[PDB]
Amino acid sequence: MEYRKIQEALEALQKGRLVLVIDDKDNEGDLICSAQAATTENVNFMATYAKGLICMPMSESLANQLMLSPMVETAFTVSIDYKETTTGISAEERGLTARMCVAEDITPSDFRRPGHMFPLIAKKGGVLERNGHTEATVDLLKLAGLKECGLCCEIMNHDGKMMRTDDLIQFSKKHNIPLITIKELQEYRKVYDQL
Amino acid sequence: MEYRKIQEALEALQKGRLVLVIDDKDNEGDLICSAQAATTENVNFMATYAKGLICMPMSESLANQLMLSPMVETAFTVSIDYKETTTGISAEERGLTARMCVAEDITPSDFRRPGHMFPLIAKKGGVLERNGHTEATVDLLKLAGLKECGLCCEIMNHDGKMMRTDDLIQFSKKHNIPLITIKELQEYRKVYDQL
Question: A11-36 burial, b for 16+ CB within 10 Å, e for fewer?
């Protein structure tokens, strides 16, 4: 609970794996991972076991590097497919679109717009500004030391409604992904990483 | 094959059920259904067994009724969530966003933009213009007599790559959804429903 399995989200993110970020009681749980570790098998795992919309929380700075506009004049930009993908729709090609976003120097026109991966721009003060799943993704990758770009997909339960708190802890102990709630990483950034 | 289980796609669409439209050999298979019959259980079935991006092929006329703009200045408009949904993300609330698109007289500002359902505008000559899964959805609902708005979601195979032709016929005989290929409904509209 508040102390302190933040370290263990961190280390799962830096090893290329998934973290379950639970919106900290309303409530909603999202899988996340770094865009660096958006493998085919991490994207197919969202897409088979979470089943919401797979999106990509990213810093404004990366969004501006990619020249990504807000879709209209949750901070969704226009969508994107890396230009070597063909349909852009499989877990494998969504994964390569994600990983090509954190490529060391890539240019806006290596992505087609619209496409199949959905960047979401995080508020600059992260969860101490807006206590969204976009900003909890970005703030874990930034405290892991990773590029501020990730994936995040909401978990639905079996019948197509959002999976609730005990479903979620059960799923986390079943697939062995580390669990974190947004309220916890807020307390953590109040004391160890303030505004 | 070319003759003639078009009738059986039709009748599955008019009974509220799903049709598997196979891109007619390159190749890609999409579940579809009418927006009239976008129930929670039809959207969760895409979202658990097809797993691509669930989108909504629609006629330009409906898109203009909704005042939907092309997302940048596959014909994706800005996305949408019907305004009574809260997160808009569950199968149930994606389903109600879909069904509220075919409501008898609904107004653009009953949808938030951006959101979680993705209209795709069909070419006016349908698959005899552009031989997409957008235009095969629209043309089946229009030959079923239904409003020209549907859902359509690409099927991925178990490992996150697009499910190929014999996977698809196997899946169709396993869940008992009627199968149609785009080449077949082209021949059908050349002879029974030309431009």
Answer: ebbbeebbbbbbbbeeebbbbbbbbb
Angle at CA of residue B157, ends B153 and B160, nearest 5°: 85
Q: Could you tell me which of A162, A175, A185, A174 has the C-alpha nearest to residue A42?
A: A175
- Kindly give, in sequence order, each residue whose CB lies less than 8 Å from that of residue B149, ignoring residues fewer than 6 positions away: B34, B35, B56, B57, B58, B59, B62, B98, B101, B102, B119, B138, B141
Beta carbons of B89 and A52 less than 8 Å apart? yes
Phi-psi region of A102 (alpha: psi -120 to 50; beta: other; left: phi over 0): alpha
Which residue bears the tokens 């290929």?
B181
CA atoms within 13 A on the CB side of B22: 22
From the list A174, A117, A187, the residue with the least C-alpha distance to A149 is A117
Distance CA(B4)–CA(B7), nearest Å, equals 7
Closest residue to A87, CB basis, from B28, B72, B89 = B28
Q: What is the resolution of this structure in A?
A: 2.0
Q: Give the residues across from B30 on adjacent strands.
A: B21, B154
Closest CB to B160: pick one of A44, A78, A159: A44
DSSP bridge partners of A21? A30, A180
List the CATH number of the domain containing B87: 3.90.870.10
Element (H, E) at B132: none
Count up the domains in chain A and report the number.
1
Residue whose entry in the numeric block shows the structure tokens 């497919």: A81
Residue among B3, B4, B13, B8 nearest B152 (CA): B13
Q: Which residue has the tokens 């009724």?
A: B65
CA A164 to each of CA A18, A183, B36, B47, B130: distance values in angstroms, whole numbers, following the listed order: 18, 16, 29, 18, 43
- How many Cβ atoms from other residues are within 10 Å of residue A191's Cβ? 8
Are B71 and A53 an interchain contact pair (Cβ–Cβ within 8 Å)?
no
Q: Which residues of B touch A161 (CB under 8 A)?
A: 40, 90-92
Q: Is A71 left (phi over 0), alpha (psi -120 to 50) or beta?
A: alpha
Domain that holds residue A152: 1-195
- Residue reference for tokens 């940048």: B72
DSSP H or E run through B149: none
Q: How far apart are the first and last CA of chain B?
A: 23
